[PDB]
Design a protein around this ligand. Structure first.
Ligand SMILES: c1ccc(CCNc2nc3ccccc3[nH]2)cc1
Ligand SMILES: c1ccc(CCNc2nc3ccccc3[nH]2)cc1
Ligand SMILES: [Zn+2]
Ligand SMILES: [Zn+2]
Lengths: 360, 360
C-alpha cells in the first residue's frame, strides 16, 4: 500500500538516471530518448509487480526485526526497490522477446510492443535487448559499493540463463526430442509421449519459477544481508512449488478465462503447448478421448480448438486441479514450517507470497 | 599461429563445460544438448576471430616482458582465451539477432541461423539470448576468484549496452529524428539532412567500435593486470579511430565487394543505411546528383540500386577514401606514439591490431 508508493516512485528515479545517462555519456538525442522512455513505460509498467514487490516485502520483514539507523532503513528499502525493478525490467525483456517469438497479438490489454506502428520487429528485438541491459546498468550504478553486489549479479545471471533454457524447453515441448535437428523442419509430436508431469514440471521450473519466485525471494534476502538467516535448500524448494502452481493457474486461464480479463486471446491449444490441461487430460483419458485429442490438438481451426475445450470440460479437470492444489497446500505449509526453524520473519514473507499466488 | 591453436582449443573446453553443466545442473536432455552444440558451433565459429585473438595478443605482449612462474603464464593465457571467447560469443549474439532484425539471408557464406529449417525465428531469437548468457556463465566460472572479475564484468556490460544503443542508432539512421514515434509508422527521410559525418561517426562508434576494438584491448589489459600501465583515454581514442576505419571498409565492401568474397549479397542501398558511401557522396554531390540519389536510394528495385552504384562510381569516392585513410594513418600513428610514453609493449600490440585492420 505505502510499500507500493515507494516502489512505484523508484521507477521515476531509475528512468531519469538511465535517460540522463544516455544523454551525458551515450550521445543520445532528445527524440531517441523519448522513444526509449516510451518503450520503457509501455513494456515495464501495467502488470501486477508481483516480482518487484516481493523483493520490497521480504526486506520490510527483516526491517521490522533488525536494528538500524533511519538512513540505513531508507538505504535498504531503496536497494529493495531497485532490485525489484531489475526483476520487472528482466520480465519486460522476456515479454517483449516472447511476444515476437510466438507472434502474439496482445499483452496487458494493449498490442504487443513489436506491433506498435513506429516500432516493428526490427526495432523491438533490440528494444528487448536494451531492457535486459538496463538491469545491469541499474545494478552497477546503485549497488557499486555494496557487499552483496557480487552475489546479486551472479544469482541474476544464473536465473536469467535458467529462464532462457526454460524458454527453449517451452518452445520445443511439442516436438519429439529424438527428432530435434537444426537442419530438419520440426514436425509436431503424434504420440504425445513427452506430455508427462515430469516433463511439464521441467518446463515450468526453468521458464517461470526461477525468475518469478526464486529471484525475488533471494534478492530480498541479499539486499537485507540476511541470506545466512535461511536454509537456502528450503528457499529453493518452496520457490519451485509455488512457481509451479502459479504457472498451472496461468495454463488453466489460457483456456478458460475470458479474453477481456486475461488481456489476450489464449492460443495454447493451437500452439500445441505442453500445458497442465493437456498433460492432466492425457493422464486420465480413455483410448477414444486420446485419439480425439490427437486429431484436434495444435491446429488453428476454431472447430478443432473447441473440440479440445470440450474434451477438457468433459474430463472434469476441475477435480484434478483441486487434488493438485490440495497437495501444493500440504507441501507449501510444510516448507513454511521448516523455514521457521532459522527465520520466523522470512517464513512469514513466504506465507504472504503464497497467499497472493493462491488467491490471485 | 601457435596463439591460434591455444585460442581455438579453449573453445572445446568452454563448450564441454557449458554442455556438461547443462546436463548436471539444468536437467538438459541429450537431444537439446546436441541442438545447442550445433547452434554454438554454427554461430560462434567460421569468422576471423579478430576480437578474441586481440585479447590473446595483448596478453602475449605483456607475457614477454613480465616475470612469472610458468603455471602463471599458462593461467594468464588461458584467461585471455576465455575472455576472447566471451567477445566472440557476444559477437555471435549480435549477428544472430541482427540477421533476424534485418531479414538477412546469408552470413559467413551459409544461411543465417534463423533460416535453418529446424531453427526458425521463434527458436533463433532465444538462441541469440542464450549466446549472450553463455558469456556471463563463462566469466563467473573461469574468473570467480580473479581480481579483475569486477572490472571485466562492468566493462563488458557497458560495452554491450553501448552496442545495443548503436544498433538503435543504426536501424533508425534513415528516419528523421524529429519524426520518431512508437505510435506512428516511420517514413524514410526525404532530405537526408541527418546523413552527416558526425552522425555517421556516432552510429559506427556505438554499433561497432566499443565491442570490436575497445573491449578486446581492455580485456587483454585486465587479464594481464596491466591496466595501470596505459593511459586509458588514449586506449579509447585509438579504439575509436581504428573501429571507425574498420566499419568504413565494411561499408565500401557492402556495395563493391563481390557476393562470394563478402559471403552475402550486400543490401545497404536498398536498406537506406547511413553508410560512409552515402554520406561521402552527399558531401561532394551537385544539386542534380543529390536529386538523383534521392529518387533512387532505399528501394528494392535493382535498376534503382544500380543507379545509386553508378552515382557512387562516377563521384570518385576512391579518392575521398584515400584522403580519409591517410588522415586515419596520421592519427593512429600519433596515438601509438603517445601510448609508448607509459607502455612500449601495449603500443606495439596496437600497432599490430592497426596493421591487421588496414591490411584485411
Ligand atoms: C526469452 C527468454 C526467456 C523467456 C522465458 C520467460 N518465461 C515466462 N514468461 C512468463 C510470462 C508470464 C508468466 C510466466 C512466465 N514465464 C522468454 C523470452
Ligand atoms: C543486437 C544488438 C546490437 C547489435 C549491434 C552490433 N554491431 C555490429 N555488428 C557488426 C557485424 C559486423 C561488423 C561490424 C558490426 N557491428 C546487433 C544486434
Ligand atoms: Zn512463448
Ligand atoms: Zn543490422
Amino acid at each position: 500500500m505505502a510499500s507500493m508508493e515507494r516502489f512505484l516512485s523508484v521507477y521515476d528515479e531509475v528512468q531519469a538516471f538511465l535517460l540522463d545517462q544516455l544523454q551525458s555519456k551515450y550521445e543520445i538525442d532528445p527524440n531517441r530518448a523519448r522513444y526509449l522512455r516510451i518503450m520503457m513505460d509501455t513494456t515495464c509498467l501495467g502488470g501486477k509487480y508481483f516480482r518487484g514487490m516481493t523483493v520490497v516485502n521480504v526486506a520490510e520483514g527483516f526491517l521490522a526485526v533488525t536494528q538500524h539507523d533511519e538512513a540505513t532503513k531508507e538505504r535498504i528499502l531503496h536497494d529493495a526497490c531497485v532490485g525489484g525493478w531489475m526483476i520487472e525490467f528482466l520480465q519486460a525483456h522476456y515479454l517483449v522477446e516472447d511476444d515476437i517469438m510466438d507472434g502474439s497479438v496482445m499483452r496487458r490489454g494493449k498490442p504487443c510492443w513489436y506491433r506498435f506502428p513506429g516500432v516493428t520487429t526490427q526495432c523491438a528485438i533490440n528494444d528487448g535487448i536494451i531492457l535486459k541491459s538496463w538491469t545491469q546498468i541499474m545494478a552497477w550504478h546503485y549497488f557499486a559499493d555494496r557487499p552483496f553486489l557480487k552475489d546479486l549479479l551472479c544469482l541474476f545471471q544464473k536465473v536469467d540463463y535458467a529462464t532462457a533454457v526454460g524458454q527453449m524447453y517451452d518452445v520445443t515441448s511439442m516436438c519429439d526430442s529424438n527428432k530435434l535437428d537444426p537442419e530438419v523442419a520440426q514436425p509436431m509430436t503424434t504420440d504425445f509421449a513427452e506430455f508427462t508431469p515430469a516433463i511439464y514440471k521441467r518446463i515450468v521450473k526453468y521458464k517461470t519459477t526461477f525468475y518469478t519466485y526464486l529471484l525475488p525471494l533471494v534478492m530480498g534476502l541479499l539486499v537485507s544481508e540476511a541470506a545466512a538467516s535461511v536454509e537456502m535448500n528450503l528457499v529453493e524448494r518452496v520457490a519451485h512449488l509455488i512457481g509451479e502452481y502459479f504457472q498451472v493457474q496461468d495454463d488453466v486461464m489460457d483456456c478458460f478465462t475470458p479474453p477481456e480479463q486475461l488481456g489476450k486471446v489464449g492460443t495454447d491449444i493451437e500452439d500445441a503447448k505442453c500445458s497442465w490441461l493437456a498433460v492432466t487430460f492425457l493422464g486420465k483419458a480413455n483410448a477414444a478421448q486420446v485419439a480425439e485429442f490427437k486429431a484436434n490438438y495444435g491446429e488453428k481451426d476454431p472447430a478443432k480448438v473447441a473440440v479440445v475445450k470440450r474434451l477438457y470440460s468433459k474430463a472434469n479437470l476441475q477435480a484434478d486441479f483441486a487434488a493438485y492444489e490440495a497437495e501444493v497446500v500440504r507441501e507449501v505449509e510444510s516448507l513454511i514450517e521448516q523455514l521457521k526453524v532459522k527465520s520466523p520473519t522470512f517464513a512469514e514473507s513466504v506465507a504472504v507470497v503464497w497467499e497472493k499466488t493462491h488467491k490471485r
